Curated annotation (Swiss-Prot), chains A, B:
Protein name per Swiss-Prot or TrEMBL: Tumor necrosis factor receptor superfamily member 21
Function: Promotes apoptosis, possibly via a pathway that involves the activation of NF-kappa-B. Can also promote apoptosis mediated by BAX and by the release of cytochrome c from the mitochondria into the cytoplasm. Trophic-factor deprivation triggers the cleavage of surface APP by beta-secretase to release sAPP-beta which is further cleaved to release an N-terminal fragment of APP (N-APP). Negatively regulates oligodendrocyte survival, maturation and myelination.
Subcellular location: Cell membrane
Entry's induction text: Up-regulated by TNF.
Disulfide bond sites: C17-C30, C20-C38, C41-C56, C59-C73, C63-C81, C83-C94, C100-C118, C121-C136, C142-C161
Post-translational modification: Oxidized in response to reactive oxygen species (ROS), leading to endocytosis.
Assembly behavior: Associates with TRADD. Interacts with NGFR. Interacts with CASP8. (Microbial infection) Interacts with hepatitis C virus (HCV) non-structural protein 5A; this interaction allows the modulation by the virus of JNK, p38 MAPK, STAT3, and Akt signaling pathways in a DR6-dependent manner.
TNFR-Cys repeat intervals: 1-38, 40-81, 83-117, 120-161
Effect of N91Q: Abolishes one glycosylation site and reduces total N-glycosylation
Organism in which the protein naturally occurs: Homo sapiens
Summary of the tissues where the protein is detected: Detected in fetal spinal cord and in brain neurons, with higher levels in brain from Alzheimer disease patients (at protein level). Highly expressed in heart, brain, placenta, pancreas, lymph node, thymus and prostate. Detected at lower levels in lung, skeletal muscle, kidney, testis, uterus, small intestine, colon, spleen, bone marrow and fetal liver. Very low levels were found in adult liver and peripheral blood leukocytes.
Residues with attached carbohydrate: N32, N91
Amino acid sequence: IGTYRHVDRATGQVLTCDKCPAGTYVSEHCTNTSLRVCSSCPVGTFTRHENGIEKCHDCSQPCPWPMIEKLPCAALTDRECTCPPGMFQSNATCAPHTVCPVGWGVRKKGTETEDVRCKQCARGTFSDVPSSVMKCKAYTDCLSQNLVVIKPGTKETDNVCGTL
Amino acid sequence: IGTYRHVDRATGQVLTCDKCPAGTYVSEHCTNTSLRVCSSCPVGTFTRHENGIEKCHDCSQPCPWPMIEKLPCAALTDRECTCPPGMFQSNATCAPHTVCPVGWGVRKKGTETEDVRCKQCARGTFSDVPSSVMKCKAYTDCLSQNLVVIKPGTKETDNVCGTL
């Protein structure tokens, strides 16, 4: 654990005291005869690093709806706010991710900061349900099935397999 | 921030959730549509590392007098107990450090776990006060003072300097 220098009020001695761990602050500095005393950051404050400070930092304000917390206000961390799952941050607030329609699929997955990116399903793949999450799916391999293709697939539907 | 696997109770899906930072525990696991929620370790418990656990660890019992805390029970740390300044741990408890008498001085400084080690003051040095802390001190250099030595020093007293 690191240390910090402190001027003792009663003697003017420059002491080397032990830092207090992340999550606490110095509630009594060391003196020439006593160890420094650490206390836990009160509800609503944090310190992220071992410190010699006399008060913890205030956490930021509550996340603005519809944002929610992905990290709480706790002893070691300020609250961290994010668009909730299924939404992504655009300018002000959060917007639902793009739904890729039938015949399209997710090329790049949506995140809390970027929208989904859809692509048309490539030949030999299909997507039969609107979704902001799913990828185009390869047709059922009728060959390797021992079957032949009864009905071709489309970008929306699997090939149908069988015999004759 | 690392992640951990969790079996979702309602669907049996094995999810990858975000760990919660040191000082908090998982008060709600992630599900397929919601981020895991972290809460701060309640008073009296800690976690030292980012974790996926559902409760923080209990801190150890209060230090046995005369031991005191050198680290508190806080969100990131169990309490850590030590013999207070001026004492060192021997078997059970704490004993005051050795006081080196006049004519001796500290050779090795006492700590919370080892006693002071005193040595007789070497020739040309002295110590005039009993102390568990101070080192033997070199005599006043009468030569470099322009003075001559009026009275020799001892292991207990400085040489006295002057002229004639």
